[PDB]
């Protein structure tokens, strides 16, 4: 048999996964790779005559939008409910987180003592004026972070925080997270907010970056560090729904979690799978247990909040 995977991940990430599943089961896995937005738009327009069987995409915001657009079908999977924590999967069973990333604080340890750091909100303290850098608001990772901030602390408080962030910028918001981390390394930025896997990716490419850039897990005294996922669900109009389901269930297993999360310097979604050592070295941390689908429910609120605060 054969299944088709629509994937918002990099093609090189899914290539060994498709091959390893084909070797284990004999099923041919065809990967169709595109940006999350255009991919979901294609899946919606193909309708009942779609070739896709599985959707893999990034960020609870995009998974929520795929669910709202009606392109996924809910599945009752005993295996996925056991292997994936409830806060990392759709409450109505449309999709399942398969890798975990944290969006958290980074700092230059030659210029900032970690005792100076605590929460996302404290980055709006005037002591950070001219020292903070951020990635652009026009990005799902920042929409999701701000979306959970609104859920955890309210709209008024979040408006004040994000407005304080912008007042404290040392530079205009960067186009991507990696540019932001490299600007901390360059000395332009003393503190910033980005996804952990880019830091692992950057240290892998340039280990000396560690001299000027360190990770700090935010909000440990409160609800925990913001986390998000990449995830997968069975497409509503799949022609092989049972085989599509057995692929996602396998992705949640020990062997596939290594291939899927570790290779991109992300955390496994399955808590019985220990993080790769490059990632685990950063240390243990309390993560937020809010259901990451809130990243989508509050996405429009977040977009309006960042626009209102002048967060470009
Ligand atoms: Na602090
Ligand atoms: Na401020
Ligand atoms: Na929470």
Author numbering: 1 to 312
Give verbatim lines from the article.
Similar to other FbpA structures, McFbpA has two globular α/β domains named the N terminal lobe (Asn1-Trp95 and Val235-Val273) and the C terminal lobe (Tyr107-Ala221 and Thr274-Lys312). These two lobes are connected by a pair of antiparallel β strands (Phe96-Phe106 and Gly222-Val234), which acts as a hinge allowing for the adoption of either the open or closed conformation. Isogenic mutants of FbpA and AfeA were constructed, demonstrating that FbpA is essential for the utilization of human Tf and Lf as iron sources and that AfeA does not take up iron from these iron sources.
Our structural studies yielded the structure of M. catarrhalis FbpA in two different forms: an apo open form and an iron-holo open form. Comparisons with other FbpAs indicate that both iron-holo and apo McFbpA in this study are in the open conformation. Two high resolution crystal structures of the M. catarrhalis FbpA were solved in the iron-holo open and apo open conformations, revealing more details about the mechanism behind FbpA-mediated iron transport. The process of how iron is bound in a class III FbpA has been proposed in studies with T. thermophilus FbpA (TtFbpA). The proposed mechanism of iron binding with insights from both the previous study and the current study is illustrated in Fig. 7. The synergistic anion (e.g., carbonate) binds to the open FbpA through the arginine residues in N terminal lobe (Step 1). The ferric ion then binds to the three tyrosines in the C terminal lobe (Step 2) which results in the FbpA adopting a closed conformation through bidentate binding of iron by the carbonate anion (Step 3).
